[PDB]
Amino acid sequence: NFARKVVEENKRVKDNRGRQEIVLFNGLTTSKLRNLLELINHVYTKVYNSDDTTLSEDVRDELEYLKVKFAYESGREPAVRTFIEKTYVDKLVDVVLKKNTKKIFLDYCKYFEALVAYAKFYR
């Protein structure tokens, strides 16, 4: 899939004191992505429990705030922002908003889950 290729292009085997860090980026860590993952999980639970074929307005506002969180974590951790540039998550958010359905949102959430899953698998 796209996520696997993106992560394997991202991944790098650095050598420090004999030990090997098989890491996408030096600053990438599960919690830094996990904050946005928690927000994604909240909004995904909202859409996945409400059972609406079209994304609700509150969910759209949640996605706007999700873009805000993208920018905020970009400001804090440069690793998160270069990951976002590599993975174009914000562009997928914009596409999801434009489609304004739950199917595209589910596909995007699966794409993000694939990204984090491949990151865990290689790391």
């Binding site: 909240h42 639970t45 429990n49």
Partner: protein, 203 residues
């Protein structure tokens, strides 16, 4: 032969964790609505254990169906030759629609994540852990059926049931209840004899 019904509400005074198959530690959720649920097995097991503690205990009840005869009469038995049908039939308590709408009015999720650091003794290095719990103030509507196998035993059985509920309100309901989890409170709506002609007005 009459069936008396006891419907009511269970309110979570604290977080309620009932495990079921990053570190989510998932709580049992009803697959249909994906909402949290209190399994009736958990309620019946906790009530039976608490009541069996209240009454005397033989040294080893390893068969688990050799409790005091009141326990077998209420919650059922399986001993060879003497199989007593369980009069109490607890049911799975689903997430109340009133509490669901109350949470949806706010920007509140039905399940919270509680962080526990699990600090060690010799190393003193905290080990992160996350437990999923049902948020405080949620309600589950519970439905219990009692079958009057014998008429003369009903008052004693309901006294035992009320003692069990009194114990359970002072205890937790699954999860790490020994460190602030699963605490519940029962509010009974209506004890009415659904089937039969037994007089359920008193109880």
């Amino acid at each position: 032969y009459s069936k008396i019904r006891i419907v009511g509400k269970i309110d979570v005074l604290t977080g309620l964790h009932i495990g079921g198959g990053a570190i989510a530690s998932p709580v049992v959720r009803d697959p249909y609505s994906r909402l949290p649920i209190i399994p009736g097995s958990s309620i019946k097991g906790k009530m039976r254990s608490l009541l069996a503690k209240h009454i005397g205990l033989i040294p080893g009840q390893k068969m688990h169906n050799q409790d005091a005869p009141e326990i077998l009469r209420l919650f059922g038995s399986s001993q060879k030759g003497a199989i007593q049908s369980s009069r109490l039939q607890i049911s799975d308590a689903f997430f109340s629609k009133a509490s669901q709408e109350e949470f949806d009015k706010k920007d509140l999720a039905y399940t919270e994540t509680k962080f526990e650091n699990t600090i060690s003794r010799l190393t003193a290095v905290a080990n992160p852990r996350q437990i999923e719990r049902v948020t405080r103030g949620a309600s589950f509507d519970f439905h219990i059926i009692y079958n009057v196998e014998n008429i003369n035993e009903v008052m004693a059985d309901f006294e035992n049931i009320k003692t069990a509920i009194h114990l359970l309100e002072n205890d937790y309901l699954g999860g790490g209840g020994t460190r602030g989890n699963g605490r519940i409170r029962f509010v009974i709506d209506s004890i009415d004899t659904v089937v039969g002609d037994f007089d359920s007005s008193n109880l």
